[PDB]
Amino acid sequence: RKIRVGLIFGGKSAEHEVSLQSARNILDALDPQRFEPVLIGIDKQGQWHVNDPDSFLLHADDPARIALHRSGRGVALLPGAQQQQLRPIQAQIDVVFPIVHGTLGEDGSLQGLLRMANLPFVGSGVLGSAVAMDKDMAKRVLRDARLAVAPFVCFDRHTAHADVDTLIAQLGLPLFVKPANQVGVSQVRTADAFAAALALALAYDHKVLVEAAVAGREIECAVLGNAVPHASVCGEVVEIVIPADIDAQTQQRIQQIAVQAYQALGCAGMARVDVFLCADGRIVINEVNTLPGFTRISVYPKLWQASGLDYRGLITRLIELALERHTDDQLLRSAVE
Amino acid sequence: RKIRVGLIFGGKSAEHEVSLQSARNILDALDPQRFEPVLIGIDKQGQWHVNDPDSFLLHADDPARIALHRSGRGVALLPGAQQQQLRPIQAQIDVVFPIVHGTLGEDGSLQGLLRMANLPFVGSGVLGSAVAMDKDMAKRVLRDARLAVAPFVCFDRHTAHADVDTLIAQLGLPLFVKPANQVGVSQVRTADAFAAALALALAYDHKVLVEAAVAGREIECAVLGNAVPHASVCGEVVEIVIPADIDAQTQQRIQQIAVQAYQALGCAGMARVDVFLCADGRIVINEVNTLPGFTRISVYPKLWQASGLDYRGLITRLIELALERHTDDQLLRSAVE
Ligand SMILES: Nc1ncnc2c1ncn2[C@@H]1O[C@H](COP(=O)(O)OP(=O)(O)O)[C@@H](O)[C@H]1O
Ligand SMILES: Nc1ncnc2c1ncn2[C@@H]1O[C@H](COP(=O)(O)OP(=O)(O)O)[C@@H](O)[C@H]1O
Ligand SMILES: [Mg+2]
Ligand SMILES: [Mg+2]
């Protein structure tokens, strides 16, 4: 009757601690009429630990020291299994809410594990996560959908044969140098600082984007839904200001763009879309993020709060969307001969 | 010293039996100086069974009855583990060669499981597999890379608001109706047969492509490699003819297109690229397939055979490429703070 929600959190990530705080907040807001929580923390070495709600954190109330209780109660996954798919090394989960920051948590890999275990789960599936996480691929698909993105060139080790001059002629200055995996970012103000930015970024990814500058205000907008996505009110990064000080017509066209970008990349459940709003009213997509923050101070939930969707209720909707997707997939999977 | 190769095969798939035959052939050709095999079969319900090389098939020599020995020796996966990641429910694998046909085996999901288990593995990673498998997404990325694809419209349940007339004005007749997941295909010769094709396809996927006809010969070309991919000689589907009866200049431009498509979609290890060669010499990409067949009669290995790469040696190269990728990823993963 109650649904069992497996919260998987942590990750090998600079944002590890953000995932800890999010898990705590989700746990406090989970509608206890409907959901029972099961907790799986992933430490900074990538090891999985089951915990109880009341002892999953060390120094919970100290932001500078908060950490995962590495209980050493390990987890096995049974691929192809239809029940008890998550097994203790040495509770049945009905839906997974993954908030694992870092490459594997965000890039479709964990999502693929969850599919292989036949687990419903919150957020974008394999494709949507993989595409959004790879900033090179995400921009090519956005571009093809006729949405505006910063002009850019993408390099790998084998082509980084980079001519700073041709780059400046095409893209200008300053240039933003980014590893394609959504640290290693640099604002290159002069042609001479480029070489080093290129080199730093390539320590983090096999692919590095070089982007022209976009002049404009930074507006962020929350999307929720599967096939019929909805958009929150906008927020302006000034340090966030909700609702953004922009007219109705402008908010509406950013909302519409956010939904369209989301559909193009094949997102589901949730994304935060970050755009630039230029002086002439052009809207340029900076980033589509399939794993927003879920702390009480994170932008994504505050954007929905300001749109009349409360935190408990956001969480409940994300779970319902995960179950909806799963049951629809169920029929199509079962159509194979 | 010897490398342990985990062969994972089978799958819930119409091509299940092709995967069985492939596994057998791979097993016979595996260089026993270098590799020891471990066998994991996935039955038609998606259940995983460990087997021994000498008893993994029922009716091995009868194509009409050949089936997986469902031994019931189950497999657990330890996510985050660095050793013994594949565990028997109730041999250390050093590299996985997945040839699991069907959605999960092909679409990045299994690849994501393998990443979560820190296993090196053969073929495209999560992104490359997810993108290539979704024919809608694959064509948009190809399109953006300025390679030619059949003109097309993509529908879901919520838009399939389909006007046959507008479709014929834009794309013509006949139309090819395809579920976006790479059965449910229909050649609609008249405007009146469309409705039903659209409806059949939508039983298999949430997305359905409608493509204009491409008039031309069918040429297939094998790609191998990670960052510097190579192309095989071409083969013509007449029923395959290797080498294709086409000039050197034409083979060279199809080879170049095959590599470019492969790079655009982020493929690794292996793909078979299928194109149309039109009367005027235009080359139109039909499909990039990240899981080709590996039977002795499959096109992919025959294309490499005709290019001077033998079957054992193809297999050895695919494993080397998997290990190369893995060790390079290793340094970048470990760069996180
Ligand atoms: N091409 C660009 N033009 C102008 N500003 C940029 C550009 N790329 C990044 N920035 C600015 O630098 C900041 C950091 O970049 P961003 O892509 O948001 O990386 P992350 O979200 O991983 O910090 C952005 O918030 C934006 O303010
Ligand atoms: N748009 C098209 N124009 C012309 N022929 C097509 C088109 N789409 C498919 N075909 C033909 O129909 C066959 C089946 O389509 P294909 O996409 O190869 O599906 P699958 O590989 O899953 O059978 C192809 O081998 C090709 O010969
Ligand atoms: Mg951003
Ligand atoms: Mg084909």
What do these coordinates show?
The structure is a homodimer of 337-residue chains. The first copy, chain A, is globular. Chain A folds into three domains: 1-122, Rossmann fold; 123-148 and 215-337, D-amino Acid Aminotransferase, Chain A, domain 1, CATH 3.30.470; 149-214, ATP-grasp fold, A domain (Dna Ligase, domain 1, 2-Layer Sandwich). Chain A is α+β, with helices and mostly antiparallel strands. Chain A has helices spanning 16-29, 103-106, 109-116, 126-133, 135-144, 164-171, 194-202, 248-265, 299-305, 311-333; strands spanning 3-10, 35-42, 48-51, 57-58, 67-68, 75-77, 86-88, 95-100, 148-149, 152-156, 175-179, 186-188, 207-212, 217-225, 230-237, 240-241, 269-277, 283-289. Chain A has ten helices and 18 strands. In chain A, strands 9-18-17-14-15-16 form a six-stranded mixed sheet, sandwiched between helices. In chain A, a hairpin with an 8-residue loop joins strand 6 and strand 7 (86-88). Chains A, B: Belongs to the D-alanine--D-alanine ligase family. Chains A, B: Its cofactor is Mn(2+); Mg(2+). Chains A, B: One of its GO terms (biological process) is peptidoglycan biosynthetic process. Chains A, B: ATP binds at residues 135, 176-178, 211-218, 286-287.
